[PDB]
Design a protein around this motif. Structure first.
Motif: not given
Ligand SMILES: [Zn+2]
Lengths: 188, 11
Positions: A50-52, A54-56, A59, A61-62
């Motif tokens: 969901n995080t990968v 969500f941000y790309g 990113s 964040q990923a």
């Protein structure tokens, strides 16, 4: 019970890792709702995905999320190696590394190039190499080739050693561990 | 560094 305690260490240690620059998981852990480690792993994997998305997938964040999921899986691996080691490594009372486990860890002199022989516990092994954890400050891990291993029963003065300050502390911690072993002094 | 120990760097 113990599972809830171990998962609390993981969630806590991963939040500390998360400062590489989920409450649901935190809640499910705090309330001891997890009934399996694979279940916990699946939730972490879901959270990663969901995080990968969500941000790309490239990113910043990923990049962090993948690292966090990796470290979490590493924690679960370590937990399986020895749950007593895992507990003491997190709780860390005085002389935590000296308390014996069941079954006892094999004790060896482990040689890394340039460092000479150092005392260590055996965490696991295969035919050609041994995963050891060294006594002394930092208590680091290393895969040691089988030919660089000597059983703890041989006298240290017959081994190539470099007597730094850290080495002395390591040998002192080793002797304290061997005493606790003979005493049958388990952590309570 | 993980609580159960980080990899010891080669000399
Ligand atoms: Zn252990």
């Amino acid at each position: 019970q113990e599972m809830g305690t171990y998962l609390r260490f993981i969630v806590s240690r991963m939040k500390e890792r998360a400062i590489d620059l989920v409450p649901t998981i935190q809640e499910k852990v705090n309330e001891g709702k997890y009934r399996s480690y694979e279940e916990f792993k699946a939730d972490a994997q879901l959270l990663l995905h969901n995080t990968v998305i969500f941000y790309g997938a490239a990113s910043a964040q990923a990049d962090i999320a993948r690292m966090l999921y990796k470290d979490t899986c590493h924690e679960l691996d370590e937990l399986q190696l020895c749950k007593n080691c895992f507990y003491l490594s997190n709780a860390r009372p005085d002389n935590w590394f000296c308390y014996p486990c069941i079954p006892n860890h094999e004790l060896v002199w482990a040689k890394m190039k340039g460092f000479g022989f150092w005392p260590a516990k055996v965490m696991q092994k295969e035919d050609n190499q041994v995963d050891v954890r060294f006594f002394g400050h930092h208590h680091q891990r290393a895969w040691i080739p089988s030919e660089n291993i000597q059983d703890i029963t041989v006298n240290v003065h017959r081994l190539h050693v470099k007597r730094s300050m850290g080495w002395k502390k390591a040998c002192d911690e080793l002797e304290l561990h061997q005493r606790f072993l003979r005493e049958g002094r388990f952590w309570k | 560094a993980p609580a159960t120990g980080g990899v010891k760097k080669p000399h």
